[PDB]
Write a protein that binds this ligand. Structure first.
Ligand SMILES: Nc1ncnc2c1ncn2[C@@H]1O[C@H](CSCC[C@H](N)C(=O)O)[C@@H](O)[C@H]1O
Length: 327
DNA sequence: TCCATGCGCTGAC
DNA sequence: GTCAGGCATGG
């Protein structure tokens, strides 16, 4: 994550729904905002969240009485994407994990915050011929909010990872916000190799497959894209090796393959998965953030997480708009 | 709400 | 054609 000099969100309160690792909290707090409520039902996610923030999030949001939630100015929610990912069944709203948005609507209807800040996968904008997005837009409009949505790629915001997500920002109408804008992209100057740990700390992650097949030669010039160098097995998900001179592929939470949830990388002549810490760095998490003791749960959590830097730029712009109150 | 891995198709080219 | 992006099942 980066450092924010002008704390645009100072004095504002927000709630951390579907908290997970707490990426939204890190981002909003870096801007001076105060967290007054968090919710997450995963046991292991609750443990890591408590390790880094000192409090346990409330459980299953579907069984929480919205009136119970503390007044707040901004509602943050990176809700479940498994039902919308192109890698799954795309049942969307017909999936038990695809209805959480309505829980969000339910909370908004009661608390009416100034801002609703949501996140999901890129496919959310196209899912079901765009009906899924329209449903969200209309729901928010009927709740008396403006709706701003855009897919952003982490690689355009200083992070060496290809992670395209849809960001949806909504301002309550009585605030008359007409100047909100998604941050503009900029040149990437950091690559996977620059975030790697020393070889002496990841020897155990090295994988030596006899069926490795180099499909491309290692490049010598860094580039803002994923560069596949080869594959193992049939080359499916988790069986693809990439160059550290390029950017990391998107981290997976439920993915498989021999290089499961991180993908494989060519490092100093050897192929290996990424270490939890490296996963934290590709997600913009500061080295001071404590990862969950179970590496398996750590990979899962980062796979589901958001990129801190992208949320920071957006949070700053939300604040910039809320603070423009000329006479 | 355990950990591991071979898929087996989908969306955007 | 090229390639990035959870489910099912075994222990
Ligand atoms: N009914 C529910 N109540 C509370 N949390 C839920 C839920 N259904 C799913 N979740 C949680 O929703 C999260 C979606 S992924 C969220 C990532 C998070 N924003 C980050 O910063 O790391 C997961 O951690 C998952 O366990």
């Amino acid at each position: 994550m980066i450092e924010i000099k002008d704390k645009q969100l100072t004095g504002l309160r927000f709630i951390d729904l579907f908290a997970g690792l707490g990426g939204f909290r890190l981002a909003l707090e870096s801007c001076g905002a105060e967290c007054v409520y968090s919710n997450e039902w995963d046991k292991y996610a609750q443990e890591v969240y408590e390790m880094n923030f000192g409090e346990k999030p409330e459980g299953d949001i579907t069984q929480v009485n919205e009136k119970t939630i503390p007044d707040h100015d901004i509602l943050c929610a990176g809700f479940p994407c498994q039902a919308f990912s192109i890698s799954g069944k795309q049942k969307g709203f017909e999936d038990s994990r695809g209805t959480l948005f309505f829980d969000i609507a339910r909370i908004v209807r009661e608390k009416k915050p100034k801002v609703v800040f949501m996140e999901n996968v890129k496919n959310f904008a196209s899912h079901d011929n765009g009906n899924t997005l329209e449903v969200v837009k209309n729901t928010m409009n009927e709740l008396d909010y403006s709706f701003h949505a855009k897919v952003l790629n982490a690689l355009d915001y200083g992070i060496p990872q290809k992670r395209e997500r849809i960001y949806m920002i909504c301002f309550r109408n009585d605030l008359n916000i007409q100047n909100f804008q998604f941050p503009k992209p900029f040149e990437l100057n950091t690559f996977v190799k620059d975030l790697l740990l020393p070889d002496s700390e990841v020897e155990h992650l090295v994988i030596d497959r006899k069926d490795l097949v180099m499909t491309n030669q290692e490049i010598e010039q860094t580039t803002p894209k994923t560069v596949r160098l080869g594959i193992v097995g049939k080359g499916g998900q988790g069986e693809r090796i990439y160059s550290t001179r390029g950017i990391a592929i998107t981290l997976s939470a439920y993915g498989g393959g021999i290089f499961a949830k991180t993908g494989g990388y060519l490092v100093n002549g050897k192929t290996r998965k990424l270490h939890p810490r490296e996963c934290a760095r590709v997600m913009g998490y500061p080295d001071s953030y404590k990862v969950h003791p179970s590496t398996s749960q750590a990979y899962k959590q980062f796979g589901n997480s958001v990129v801190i830097n992208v949320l920071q730029y957006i949070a700053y712009n939300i604040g910039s708009s809320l603070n423009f109150k000329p006479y």
